């Protein structure tokens, strides 16, 4: 049933905005 979670994340990363992209890039560098 892992494919259901994969699909849930797939739609989430598709819907995510550029501001979220820039925010996560900074947070990845910080951590």
């Amino acid at each position: 049933a892992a494919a259901e979670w994969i699909s849930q994340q797939r739609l989430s990363l598709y819907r995510r905005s550029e501001r979220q992209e820039l925010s996560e890039l900074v947070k990845n560098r910080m951590k």
């Binding site: 699909s7 797939r10 739609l11 598709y14």
Partner: protein, 77 residues
């Protein structure tokens, strides 16, 4: 034409005449009949220029290319 060059080869040397004839008829695809390009051994980046110029007439062309290349991932594509 210089990707895999067999100078002692009549076939690859005859392809020069064919490509010159296509270049005579005004064909933009004259490199097409070269064996390395036809086999996928070479491609040129100037093609992406044609993709951009084509996008003035085909606004979907860039999207289709990236979907085939996997560059953009749309769910259900």
């Amino acid at each position: 034409r210089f990707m895999q060059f067999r100078a002692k080869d009549s076939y690859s040397l005859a392809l020069s005449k064919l490509e010159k004839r296509e270049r005579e008829n005004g064909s933009n695809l004259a490199f097409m009949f070269r064996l390395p390009f036809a086999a996928g051994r070479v491609f040129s980046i100037s093609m992406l220029d044609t993709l951009l110029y084509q996008s003035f007439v085909k606004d979907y062309m860039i999207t289709i290319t990236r979907l085939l290349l996997g560059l953009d991932t749309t769910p259900g594509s």
